[PDB]
Structure formats: C-alpha cells, structure tokens
Amino acid sequence: FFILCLPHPKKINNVLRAPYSWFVKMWGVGADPIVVLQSTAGDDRNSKDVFYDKFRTEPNRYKALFRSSFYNESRRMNEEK
Amino acid sequence: HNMAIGTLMQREVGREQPGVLTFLSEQYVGDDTLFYTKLHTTDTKVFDKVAASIFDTVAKCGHEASPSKTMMTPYSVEKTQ
Amino acid sequence: YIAPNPRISSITLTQRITTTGPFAILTGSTPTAQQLNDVRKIYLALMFPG
Amino acid sequence: TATREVDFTVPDVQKILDDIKALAAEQVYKIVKVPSISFRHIVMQSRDRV
C-alpha cells in the first residue's frame, strides 16, 4: 500500500480508501455457518439497554441471496476502483 | 431533506413490490440514512427488482446515489463512522 | 451412541425468552477419556444381565 | 469450544412463515384455449378401417 500512494499520496489514498472500507463491511456475510455474539435489548430497534450472552453459531438464511446481480455489479465497480 | 426523500423511498417499494421489505426504523443524521428493515424473501430475481426500485426513487428525486456506496446487507452496520 | 434431541429440555418462545431446564449445568458438560470408559461398562452390564 | 458445533435448537419461525406465504401463490390449475389431445389414429395400409 505504501508503494502505491508514494507517487501522489493525497490523491491515491482518497480514491483507494473506498474499496478498503467496503471490503471490511462485506467480509463474513456469505458463509453458511455464521458466528454472532447474541445480544438482547428492548423492543424498539434503537434501544440502547443491551445485555450480552455468549458466542454461538447459526446457519445463514441469506446464503443463496449473494448470487444476485446487485452484488455482482457492485463488486466489479470496486474492483475497478 | 433525507426524511422527505426517505419517506418517498418506502412508498415506491410498497407500491411496486408489495409485501416485501417492511420498514421498522428510520434514523436520519447528517448526510446519512439508516433503515432497519427485514426482508421477506431470499430470492435472486425478486430482490434484484426491489433493489432496483430504490435507486429509481433517488434518481427521480435528482440525486445520484452510487450502487457501490449503497449498503444492503444483513450482518453489517456502519453509522457515523 | 445417540444423544437425545436437544429441544426436549428447553422450549424457545419469541427470540430471547427460552425455558431453562433444571439440570442445565450437567447437560452442558463433557466426559473425559476416563469417564467415558465408565459409560461403556454400564452398557456392558445391561446387555449381559446377571 | 462454544461455537464449534452448528446450532439447531432454536427454529427460525420467520423463515417458515415466508414459505407458507410463497405456497399461496402456487397456481394449481391452468387456463388454456384448446383442451389436450385424447385420441390418435394410425393407418393400417387401408382406406376404410383405422
């Protein structure tokens, strides 16, 4: 990474930070056994009073969803970037 | 302005592909929206048409939201860095 | 050897409201190599009665 | 050791309600303009009897 910016580091890093941030978001989303940290809070989706349980794994429900054309188009735009 | 756009987001999804993608939360901050929804089908064709009607609502408002910037994922969240 | 069906001793209601069985600390335990050989003696004394 | 075995003791109710809904769109019948064929004839080198 340091060799690539070193020509023009303020311009290279501003356009290479987008596929580096996108890679960490969409990493472990497609695997079939998914390990989560089981949490519990209020009925509202914005409740902050959360209680944590131990780790566990669960089968992914969205396994076949990532065969779509939304992600396949979104991945080649990031490989272009 | 994100609230007036985001309320037009839920209408066209409810009027072209009804019964899918019920909305449960609406968080609007500076230059960001965050919809906590749940998806009612793991389909390759139907989800490809629901995800197309979201971009057609923003583009027919005037803005240009990139498909590489838009996030539609089950197990990842970014909100205010 | 067949362990019993794990949902016999616990029912889950909504997402996070599950029944907790009475022997919840023994069912979530594991036999060592010595304590499993003692199990094989019990199924060696039941198939041969006297 | 807490995440080794894959879990199944909590049945996902939201998945089995999305499959009852998808079962309601199963079109059993069909709408056609002409009914299907039910008799065919073969010619035994004749002009009167098939």
Following the backbone from N to C, one meets helices and strands of chain A in this order, namely HHEEH
Helicity of chain A, as a percent range: 40-55%
Order of strands, main sheet of chain A, comes to 1-2
Subunit organisation of the chains:
part of a larger assembly
Q: Roughly what percent helix of chain C?
A: 25-40%
What is the makeup of the main sheet of chain A? 2 strands, antiparallel
Largest sheet of chain C: none
Rg of chain C is: 16 Å
* DSSP helical segment count of chain C: 2
Q: How many E-type strands of chain C? A: 0
Which structural category fits the helices and strands of chain A? Answer: alpha+beta
Shape of chain A: extended
Number of helices of chain A: 3
The geometry of chain C reads as: elongated
Please indicate the percent range of residues of chain A in DSSP E strands (runs of 2 or more). Answer: 15-25%
User: Structural class from helices and strands of chain C?
Assistant: mainly alpha
Note the run of SSEs of chain C as H and E: HH
Distance between the termini of chain C: 23 Å
Radius of gyration of chain A: 18 Å
Strand proportion of chain C:
under 5%
Name the chain pair with the biggest interface and residue counts per chain: A-B, 25 and 20 residues
Protein name (chain D): VP3
Subcellular location (chain D): Virion
Organism (chain D): Bluetongue virus 1
Protein name (chain A): RNA-directed RNA polymerase
What does this structure look like?
This is part of a larger assembly, with 2 copies of chain A (81 residues) and 2 copies of chain C (50 residues). Chain A has 81 residues and is α+β, with helices and mostly antiparallel strands. Chain A is 41% helix and 21% strand. Chain A is built from 3 helices and 2 strands. Chain A is extended, with a radius of gyration of 18 Å. With 50 residues, chain C is an all-alpha fold. Chain C has helices at residues 24-27, 33-45. Chain C starts with 23 loop residues before the first helix and ends in a 5-residue tail after the last helix. Chains B and D meet through loops of B and helix 1 of D.
